[PDB]
Design a protein around this nucleic acid. Structure first.
Ligand SMILES: Nc1ncnc2c1ncn2[C@@H]1O[C@H](COP(=O)(O)NP(=O)(O)OP(=O)(O)O)[C@@H](O)[C@H]1O
Ligand SMILES: Nc1ncnc2c1ncn2[C@@H]1O[C@H](COP(=O)(O)NP(=O)(O)OP(=O)(O)O)[C@@H](O)[C@H]1O
Ligand SMILES: [Ca+2]
Ligand SMILES: [Ca+2]
Ligand SMILES: [Ca+2]
Ligand SMILES: [Ca+2]
Ligand SMILES: [Ca+2]
Lengths: 934, 908
RNA sequence: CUAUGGUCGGA
RNA sequence: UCCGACC
RNA sequence: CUAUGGUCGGA
RNA sequence: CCGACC
């Protein structure tokens, strides 16, 4: 224990005042947030009484407004607010809505202040909706709390000295989180799980250097409204040791290593849709997994089991899938993995089966929540995959001819790049074609979410949506530079991402869920692939794969055996199973294991049927993996072993359960070297140009062990890595960064590595060229139509000096806004801040009334907004382009659509925001209209 | 009427002798419209003209070709992008009976049509087509000059004995086919007759359109059919084979003799019978198929194609066993309709008319229903199944509509599903608009909902929507279309690889065939029903097992029948083949399970009434002797004799309608009268190829003797909207139309007819501008004078409305309402070319809405629906809750509702 | 330095 | 860029 | 007097 | 309404 660290930790959480005690949790959570955002103290006695209006509020703004009446909060702008729908569910829906759960979340960062009197600064995140899990469905979404705390074991200079200077500081923080309850919004929260959230950006509001953080989950053991011994406001006291007992059934699972049992807490936190509750007589718990016909004892169906057609149909019905899913990824009590339809089920009786490989603990499957099929994902329409940097070295190593494939793969890159550019170049010629291309290039989900095309100031947020909106109003990309600039910026970034990452697209490739052949119709080295609908490559299209060789691989891929070549055979017996890849249950070892120790529990495989990539590949036998026992030490302490220290009985289990949390939290907070070790393997293999050498194979095994550290209880310290680096590896500790990690070639001579040849010799030369050709194929800013209103007002100015003053004030105000735009808290807030000043410009009688048209609620739909936009265009079309568009792009589109319309030639349509989002381009119309001209 | 026939065609005078054919045709057409007799000013501007309008302008002293066609005719040699321009004419009987011309000629404007082998080889300019009223017509409107029939032989002689002169070229008839009953241009059967230009003013004795070489029709036919080696064939069938030359086919490639595989024997039955199992179908290379995709713009290689290669006519399928990159094609005796050397490129060019494409649901034909009941193990079960499906389907259509109307977004999707306007949109480039609203009511509903109007809350929209369903329900009453989702019409191919057994078929889809709840990419382990139209015999529908063979997996959007077995399955299907035949394939269990097969019937020999002219070309030549002159005379005689055979009236339509009427009265399709009628109608369809001669006398003999009932047979009850028969309806069609569909339709109709919280015409949002300018007018007489004038002027227009051309006249007066100072300029924007986009138009629409929503509702929406939509979109927008978009007319017509958006949003 | 790849969802 | 599950 | 069914485009 | 095709 370290005293200085402990003193700062005594009061880091926001306090709950007596006045707020009556408040519902949702209002309490939101009111505390505003007070913190505005610096006001909740317990401050200078001004506080509960407002009955808060008890019955469907908008947070109403609650926050009553507080803003006090001057204390009046100066600061309002903080991010919970969406109204989430707030309503928290107050009246019991924190759950159509499977979704409101989540109380917080992010914690270190206090810059080093004063001995809070170590951590806390921001409570707004109320948000997130898919529910088993535990939220069983004990209440209101009894759970997530925090992102900076990891005590961070080796960053950013860490405060109090933690770094005083050893034992790590233990004090772990004790602080795991020893006792934490008070917040009237509830006592106890910790029960923690997982790595990765290196994260410290909050700017509080502070700039990334620090490793940890997600710690809390459970409300008790609260003010809690009752000793169903509604969120009247929960019954319950100890963390009891929720965990309900989930893991600890009594029958004391034989497991406690660190792995702690790992299984995630299965109760997995975000899943609840489908149905099977009856006990409908569950077939297999006691033996499918085993090798050879006799090797290898399991051939790891994590995959069968399910009835009726169960699959209910999944479709509950999720509105529209087609019955051949396979699903879900959890069923202790069972985790995949479930596939039994092709032999002819009845309508519900049934599911579990396998040992699936059941992660011993479960009795009695509670309804332990017999509920929770679905996390469904096999769905397949999309084309690409190559990645990890598959290239392995592809070169197993190539029969390395030189042939290096050029062959490079061909796919140059051909795809020229084709990518050619389609855009031709489409840019006609706006109907460019719109259709832009829609194909990328926003349905945002449109459904916002019920409108989301807008940042006066233009659509998305650049693809901005281009389509402007073209829909009559703007030509070949005639308006602003539109041209967007397409240029778009392609440049898309090419930049190809330069930065060699995501070489392979059309005859896809990521498909891996399933096992329970029916034994597939022989070893034979796979079955079926597609729900036509899979289209530009040259040809497929509904199934037959009479072809395919390459199956999984990420992460390090070993030469990680990519394997197999023959695709279509078995009419497995025709119903579509959008899945079925490996054989025959053979000594499951094919999935060859793929980076893969399973059929949710794993997806990279399937390539491209011949120019498949036929140059030869298979490798699985490698002899080294024994790294000295470097990697595994804690296999069982729950029973922890229990012996305490004794026998309920109290002993309760103490043991808390001890498992404390011990596991230390193991979790321990530093992970998976990234450093994988990066080292890349550097070493680059220097040696070998992914097959003994150092590579050793490093491939170490990275393979490190990824499974939490489940396998592996303790690895910086010392063991150095010890491993100096003994098994050739006494090299710090290795040079590779040339590819660099934008421009800094190497001596022609590129030597496969990735180097592709990045600097096949991609950058082609990319630099295709851009120039596209630029040459690609136009002013000026538009005599976008300034019709300016001409109208100058003519009016000649008639009246009052008409002249309005223009003078308008022009000067527009210039002030431009100065602000040049000067300007992230980018969106700055844009809105300039936009508010833009919309501020206002007429300030008969002319003013005609200009303001105040009967219209949106002033941005009045004639004055149009004149204000036309004048801005005349003022800044050459001077500052982005200003006129980012601000008045919407009104400019109105003007163009008004000007382009010509008598007797149809009628333009003013579409409501919502109805505009629903419409989509008709490809059929585009081809036929193009045909009539051509 | 020979004297009338002397001057039928428009005359060509010396002043037009030195003229391009395209200009001559167009100028002749214009003189005819203006009735200026051709019989001396020739403008040379025409020869280099690229638009007819410019040529026509020269004729300013006293139905028009598109620009592309005229250009192609003038400088493209009459051929562009495969298309050939066509000189078509329509002939109609002259009203005057003066011994004046018998027919009146209207030369149709030059137009693009798909090319044929004959147009490609000899030039489209050498081909002329006409639609002539048939001489054998029994209609009263036939002029007495021919009605007396002292005449049929003479008119046939006029068409075939000699050449005809129209635009400087001599035209001789080579082929004729039935064009059906066609209304005379301002109903009588017409025959299409095809003419070829043997000689012309620009022709050369012993190539450019204006520099052709003289070629007789006999020679052209000799090139196509190789008559020297085809004398054995009956002349009537050889005349029939001319159609293959005139078939509209896309030219893909010319194959070299070494790449052409000719087979001396077809695939025969392995069980000795010697029946043919591959009639009309052969194999091609994956490379040949790839070029069909490349030249035709297909997004995938076709697995089977329908086309012609020389003598061969039929279907070609990719060899699943072909691993090569070399072009090859196969020919079989069944496909070849004449002996061809395959020496000329035009006779070695693969010509594709159609490709196997994505399949669609077909539904149940009325012909199929009697056969289904006749061959069902339990008839009552079959009746209850199809009937219950119809009841369920009808309820679903209505249920979807009622739920859809509740939410705008949802209703828009249904309206698009109900009717597609893409054909109209692409042609106009915009949504067609009459006055102030879209021309189509369905488009009007979408346009107004897009601006924010709700059908449930707005009366105008509700009334239109109610009318649309009323029309759809009325359409349902008139015709009983039972629709089966698990049904499709698929091209039939044969198994060249021997995988399938006798009762097995293989079907694979190019994509996902979607049924309401289930989806298919292949058919496996299911029983299917295979049938063809026309289906009359009890055996014309057969039940088979669908087995997916991976060996045939690359063949998609085709159903493969077995080569094993005594008789091919196709023959069972109304005497079918694999030459382009499409089978109705149904895998809906409830339809399939009750069916049990029937063997092919023993058909009666009706030779007494059906006689075949099996006279051969050699027999016709024997009359003329031996030699080229004898062949020329025989070829011309065949055209003349064949023209008579073809012009003979066809009784298939009357005979089929009789079988339908008698079989309905008997309620049997398996009885002796039905089998006899079925054989007669089966033979009559193949009359042209088989030389069958049938006359009213032959028909009256069959009716008097075999069929019985030589009396007018009454029409079936199902042919009428309601059930006037006695008792509950007992015929399958009558039960389904009157005892099942009508009540269900009526129940929904009563529900719609049966129906303050409801649709109201009033919208406070639409009177916004009126109230805005009232407040100004109350404090300004100057504006008030303008306001009063507009209100009264609208009143004048409202009086003018009264109640397509008329609506436009009112719209013109409505647009005329315009101002007649700073205010008037703001109201009427000069900068805007379309003043319908100005502020004044919105004010006039608002003032018109308030004044006439109660009294003259239709007047406001027809005149100002456009502006009312703008006003609605403006008023409904709320600050910071999105931005309404002003689409252009063109960009608007190119947008379609995203079905995924409608479903996802409703779930929200 | 520095501390992984991949699938998908979001605002 | 940020946020959240999954292997 | 009345004079067929089906598949595919369309204007 | 006018075109292919079986
Ligand atoms: N964060 C990650 N980064 C890279 N690879 C990962 C990551 N997470 C999972 N994988 C891959 O997926 C595998 C994880 O396997 P599982 O998630 O199936 N867990 P497993 O070890 O099988 O234990 P059970 O829960 O099944 O009893 C790893 O070995 C990696 O190959
Ligand atoms: N106008 C029509 N009305 C009804 N059925 C028709 C019609 N035209 C064609 N069919 C159908 O298609 C069949 C024609 O068969 P084909 O078009 O296959 N010709 P076919 O007699 O076999 O001789 P070939 O040219 O192949 O040597 C008819 O028997 C009908 O089943
Ligand atoms: Ca594993
Ligand atoms: Ca796994
Ligand atoms: Ca696993
Ligand atoms: Ca036939
Ligand atoms: Ca990652």
């Amino acid at each position: 224990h370290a005293p200085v660290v402990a003193a700062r930790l005594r009061n880091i959480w926001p306090k709950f005042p007596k006045w707020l005690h009556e408040a519902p949790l949702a209002v309490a959570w939101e009111v505390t947030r505003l007070f913190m955002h505005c610096k006001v103290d909740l317990e401050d006695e200078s001004l506080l009484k509960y407002d009955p209006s808060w008890s019955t509020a469907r908008d947070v703004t109403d609650i926050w407004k009553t507080l803003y009446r006090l001057d204390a909060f009046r100066g600061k702008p309002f903080p991010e607010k919970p969406p109204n729908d989430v707030f309503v569910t928290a107050m009246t829906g019991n924190f759950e809505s159509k499977g979704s759960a409101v989540v109380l979340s917080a992010v914690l960062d270190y206090n810059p202040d080093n004063s001995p009197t809070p170590l951590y600064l806390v921001k409570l995140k707004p109320l948000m909706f997130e898919q529910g899990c088993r535990l939220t469905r069983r004990f209440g979404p209101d009894r759970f709390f997530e925090i992102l705390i900076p990891s005590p074991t961070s080796t960053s200079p950013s860490v405060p000295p109090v933690v770094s200077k005083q050893p034992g500081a790590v233990e004090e923080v772990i004790q602080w989180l795991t020893m006792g309850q934490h008070s917040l919004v009237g509830r006592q929260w106890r910790a029960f799980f923690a997982k790595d959230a990765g290196y994260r950006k410290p909050l700017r509001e509080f502070q700039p250097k990334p620090i490793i953080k940890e997600r710690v989950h809390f459970f409300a053991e008790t609260g003010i409204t809690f009752r000793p011994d169903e509604p969120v406001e009247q929960r019954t006291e319950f100890k963390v040791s009891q929720m965990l007992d309900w989930l893991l059934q600890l009594d029958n699972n004391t034989w497991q290593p406690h660190l792995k049992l702690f790992s299984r807490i995630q299965l109760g936190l997995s975000k899943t849709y609840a489908i149905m509750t099977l009856e006990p007589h409908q569950i077939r718990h297999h006691k033996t997994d499918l085993l090798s016909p050879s006799g090797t004892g290898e399991v051939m169906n790891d994590g995959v089991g069968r399910m009835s057609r009726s169960v699959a149909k209910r999944i479709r019905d509950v999720l509105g899938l529209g087609d019955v899913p051949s396979a699903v990824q879900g959890r069923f009590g202790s069972a985790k993995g995949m479930w596939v339809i039994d092709v032999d089920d002819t009845g309508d009786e519900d049934w599911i089966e579990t396998y040992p490989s699936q059941r992660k603990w011993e479960c009795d499957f009695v509670d309804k929540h332990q017999r509920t099929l929770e679905v996390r994902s469904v096999a769905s329409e397949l999309k084309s995959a690409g190559l990645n940097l990890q598959l290239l070295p392995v592809l070169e190593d197993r190539a029969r001819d390395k030189v042939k494939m290096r050029q062959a793969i490079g061909d796919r890159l140059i051909n795809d790049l020229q084709r990518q550019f050619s389609e855009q170049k031709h489409a840019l010629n006609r706006p109907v074609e460019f719109r259709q291309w832009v829609y194909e290039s990328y926003s349905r989900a945002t449109r459904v979410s916002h019920g409108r095309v989301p807008f940042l100031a006066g233009l659509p947020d998305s650049q693809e949506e901005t281009l389509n909106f402007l073209m829909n109003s009559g703007f030509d990309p070949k005639k308006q530079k602003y539109l041209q600039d967007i397409a240029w910026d778009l392609q440049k970034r898309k090419c930049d991402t190809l330069k930065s990452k060699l995501n070489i697209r392979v059309g005859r490739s896809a990521y498909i869920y891996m399933i096992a052949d329970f029916w034994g119709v597939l022989e070893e080295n034979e796979v079955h692939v079926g597609f729900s609908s036509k899979f289209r490559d530009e040259e040809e299209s497929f509904t199934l794969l037959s009479d072809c060789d395919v390459l199956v691989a999984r990420s992460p891929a390090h070993f030469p055996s990680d990519i394997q070549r197999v023959r695709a055979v279509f078995k009419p017996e497995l025709h119903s199973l579509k959008d899945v890849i079925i490996f054989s249950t025959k053979g000594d070892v499951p094919l999935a294991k060859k793929l980076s120790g893969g399973d059929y529990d949710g794993d997806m495989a990279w399937v390539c049927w491209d011949p120019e990539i498949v036929d140059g590949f030869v298979n490798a036998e699985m490698p002899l993996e080294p024994d790294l026992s000295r470097y990697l030490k595994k804690d296999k302490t069982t729950f029973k072993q922890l229990m012996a220290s305490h004794g026998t009985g309920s109290a002993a289990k309760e103490q043991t359960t808390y001890d498992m949390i404390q011990k596991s939290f230390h193991f979790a907070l321990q530093p992970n070297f998976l990234g450093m070790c994988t990066n080292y393997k890349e550097r070493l293999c680059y220097i040696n140009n070998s992914v097959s050498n003994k150092p590579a194979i050793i490093l491939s095994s170490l990275v393979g062990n490190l990824v499974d550290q939490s489940k396998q209880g592996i303790v690895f310290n910086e010392a063991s890595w150095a010890q491993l680096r100096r003994e098994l590896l050739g006494g090299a500790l710090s290795l040079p960064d590779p040339m590819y990690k660099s934008d421009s070639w800094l190497g001596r001579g022609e590129p030597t590595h496969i990735i180097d040849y592709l990045k600097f010799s096949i991609a950058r030369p082609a990319i630099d060229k295709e851009l120039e050709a596209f630029h040459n194929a690609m136009a002013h800013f000026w538009d005599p139509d976008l300034a019709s209103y300016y001409t109208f007002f100058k003519e009016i100015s000649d008639k009246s000096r009052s008409s002249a003053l309005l223009f003078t004030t308008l022009k000067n105000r527009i210039g002030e806004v431009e100065k602000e735009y040049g000067r300007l808290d992230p980018y969106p807030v700055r844009v809105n801040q300039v936009y508010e000043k833009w919309c501020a410009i206002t007429p300030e009688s008969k002319v003013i009334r005609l200009l303001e048209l105040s009967f219209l609620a949106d002033r941005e739909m009045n004639t004055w907004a149009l004149l204000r936009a036309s004048t801005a265009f005349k003022l800044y079309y050459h001077k500052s382009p982005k200003f006129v568009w980012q601000m008045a792009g919407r009104q400019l589109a109105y003007i163009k659509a008004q000007m382009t319309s010509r008598p007797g030639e149809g009628a333009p349509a003013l579409m409501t925001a919502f109805m505009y989002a629903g419409l989509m381009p008709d490809k059929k119309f585009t081809k036929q209209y193009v045909a009539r001209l051509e």
